[PDB]
Write a protein that binds this ligand. Structure first.
Ligand SMILES: *[C@@H]1O[C@H](CO)[C@@H](O[C@@H]2O[C@H](CO)[C@@H](O[C@@H]3O[C@H](CO)[C@@H](O)[C@H](O)[C@@H]3O)[C@H](O)[C@H]2NC(C)=O)[C@H](O)[C@H]1NC(C)=O
Lengths: 218, 218
């Protein structure tokens, strides 16, 4: 048994998207397909369900009109269409297999990520950050490599060939205005910092960008 | 639409300590066949939810016996006897009794330990930031527990609050300590105009805010 979902999607506000969930290894037509929304913040919200065998569908009142379900019996796939996309529709959507009053949602899809925004594929703008001139030097000093002005997610910030696997704190990306920005901090002894060389290996698969820039001491 | 409410929103419990999540229904979710259809799901970070319990008490095939459910009417509870690091995540309710079927709010389970003091730091904008025409003042508050943290920026004695960037990192594993990377962005004309930039840190471990500032004039 396996439920396979479509890939990540990026759409502009006011558009519509069509996600799909393909089920194999069981009687596809005889199990309901539950659609669950998970905003990045928190919470699981059920959009509705469809029984592919018949055409029966149910919708939660919050999503009635926003989402429409359809199923294809020939190819064991179920579709959900979201209309008039907005910012609040950006979330990760799951599909699950359910039989009411019997076997519960034991199998889920991998999750399809949908982002609604008018931005384009902007590359990263990494700004390596060094300690300020007016700052005391201690035994343990934390470095800083800022990345901002990039879209869409994700950007894999790391060190040179995993130079410092431990002591790394990659803070989550956030939308400052319309683009995503993140940060990182790695603890390194002041003794080895002048000698040992490490650089934040910022990456951006969506823009096919791979730029790394280290911080110079003050 | 039956509303399911979970309390507490968060439940810090140390390893080996019994945990107890609770669930409430806007209306009774009993069914005629002699069963009430309540299910418990666990969603670890970056993964789809996994089924744990169904029909209040029945355990899904392959879950440790430490999990157990019980309840009736509009009151149900999930108990974890001996918690373990693999049990971290968000636990969700699900009523499968009345159409449409609704999820619970969720209860983020965390592990508690001895409080750790914050490690505050401030880094001024880098050269490339000046060249690009901006300002990236970043404050790093690493390894602080619990979540009782607040950030306030008082520029040259004036408290700025518009355009504040708030970013928090989830609980770690090696140390299980939170972190914060709230920052602020300023324009060159708005950056050179002022003189003193400060970043306080208010935490339970130290009631007095921690001061970490630099002056533009150097
Ligand atoms: C539709 O009607 C059938 C026939 O009465 C119902 O089947 C019965 O369901 C109950 C509840 O699960 C079964 O009792 C339970 O059986 C399990 C497995 O043996 C056991 O572990 C439990 O402790 C409990 O005894 C009962 O055996 C079963 N009877 C038959 C003949 O299958 C069914 O629940 C009804 N469905 C609905 C939606 O009303």
């Amino acid at each position: 048994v396996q439920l396979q979902q479509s890939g990540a999607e990026v759409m502009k506000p006011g558009a519509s998207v069509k996600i799909s969930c393909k089920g194999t290894g069981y009687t596809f037509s005889s199990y309901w397909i539950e659609w669950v929304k998970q905003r990045p913040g928190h919470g699981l919200e059920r959009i509705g369900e469809i029984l592919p065998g018949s055409g029966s569908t149910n919708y939660n009142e919050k999503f009635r009109g926003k989402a429409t379900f359809t199923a294809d019996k020939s190819s064991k796939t179920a579709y959900m269409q979201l209309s008039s996309l907005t910012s609040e529709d950006s979330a990760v959507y799951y599909c699950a297999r359910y039989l009411p009053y019997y076997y519960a949602m034991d199998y889920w899809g991998q999750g399809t990520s949908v982002t609604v925004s008018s931005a384009k594929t902007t590359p990263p703008s990494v700004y390596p950050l060094a300690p300020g001139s007016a700052a005391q030097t201690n035994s343990m000093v934390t470095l800083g490599c800022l990345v901002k002005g990039y879209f869409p997610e994700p950007v894999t910030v790391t060190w040179n060939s995993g130079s410092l696997s431990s002591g790394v704190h990659t803070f989550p990306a956030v939308l400052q205005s319309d683009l995503y920005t993140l940060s990182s901090s790695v603890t390194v002894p002041s003794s080895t910092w002048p000698s040992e060389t490490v650089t934040c290996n910022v990456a951006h698969p969506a823009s096919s960008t791979k730029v790394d820039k280290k911080i110079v001491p003050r | 639409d039956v509303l399911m409410t979970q309390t507490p929103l968060s439940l810090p419990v140390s390893l080996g300590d019994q945990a107890s999540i609770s669930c409430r229904s806007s209306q009774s979710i009993v069914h005629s066949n002699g069963n009430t259809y309540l299910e418990w799901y666990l969603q670890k970070p970056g993964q789809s939810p996994k089924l744990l319990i169904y029909k209040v008490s029945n355990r899904f095939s392959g879950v440790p016996d430490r999990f157990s459910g019980s309840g009736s009417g509009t009151d149900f509870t999930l108990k974890i006897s001996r918690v373990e690091a693999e049990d971290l995540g968000v636990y969700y309710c699900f009523q499968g009794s009345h159409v449409p079927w609704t999820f619970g709010g969720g209860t983020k389970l965390e592990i508690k330990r001895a409080d750790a003091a914050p490690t505050v730091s401030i880094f001024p904008p880098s050269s490339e930031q000046l060249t690009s025409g901006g300002a990236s003042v970043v404050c790093f508050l690493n390894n602080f527990y619990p979540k009782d943290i607040n950030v306030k920026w008082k520029i040259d004695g004036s408290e700025r609050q518009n355009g504040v960037l708030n970013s928090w990192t989830d609980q770690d594993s090696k140390d299980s300590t939170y972190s914060m990377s709230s920052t602020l962005t300023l324009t060159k004309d708005e950056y050179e105009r002022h003189n003193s930039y400060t970043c306080e840190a208010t935490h339970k471990t130290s009631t007095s805010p921690i001061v970490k500032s630099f002056n533009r004039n150097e």
